[PDB]
Design a binder for this molecule. Structure first.
Ligand SMILES: *[C@@H]1O[C@H](CO)[C@@H](O[C@@H]2O[C@H](CO)[C@@H](O)[C@H](O)[C@H]2NC(C)=O)[C@H](O)[C@H]1NC(C)=O
Lengths: 50, 99
């Protein structure tokens, strides 16, 4: 990344050389990931405000 | 649609266009770049005398505006606005006779 820039994308990042139309395939994983912060989790996975 | 977050508007509104075809006596310069994501635009204006070519001399440029755009930049296009009266049969997208 170029410092202080916002990546606004929806297209699926090509892993394993897979042209995907937002779809799955041979190791074609979703470009986004959502933190699974289960409430009252462990310290190493507790959420922090930064 | 808008889908936008940033705004910077100053409106000391005043009208002066003076549609003319005479020799150019008003010249503007704008220089655009970015460092660390801070987009910097430097601005200047000066009067000249030549009519057709570029007046070759020496001048200065000073910064005017800075923004925290934080966005990938690859392309740019300028903006132009011209529409004629009922006289021109060619519509706005079609015809114009004041270039
Ligand atoms: C900004 O946009 C440009 C597109 O103009 C991106 O350039 C592409 O980068 C990928 C990286 O894998 C290349 O595969 C493409 O071929 C590039 N496109 C062109 C037209 O050269 C660039 O990656 C974007 N991001 C940054 C930080 O510059």
């Amino acid at each position: 990344l170029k410092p202080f820039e916002r990546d606004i994308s929806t297209e699926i990042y090509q892993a394993g050389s897979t042209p995907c139309n937002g779809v799955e395939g041979f190791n074609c994983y979703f470009p986004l990931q959502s933190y699974g912060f289960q409430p009252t989790n462990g310290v190493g996975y507790q959420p922090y405000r930064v | 649609a808008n889908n936008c977050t940033f705004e910077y508007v100053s409106q000391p509104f005043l009208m002066d266009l003076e549609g003319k075809q005479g020799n150019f006596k008003n010249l503007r310069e704008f220089v655009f770049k970015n460092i660390d994501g801070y987009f910097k635009i430097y601005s200047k204006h000066t009067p000249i005398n030549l009519v057709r070519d570029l007046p070759q001399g020496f001048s200065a440029l000073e910064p005017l505006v800075d923004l925290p755009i934080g966005i990938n930049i690859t392309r740019f296009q300028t903006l132009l606005a011209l529409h004629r009266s009922y006289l021109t049969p060619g519509d706005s997208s079609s015809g114009w006779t004041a270039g």
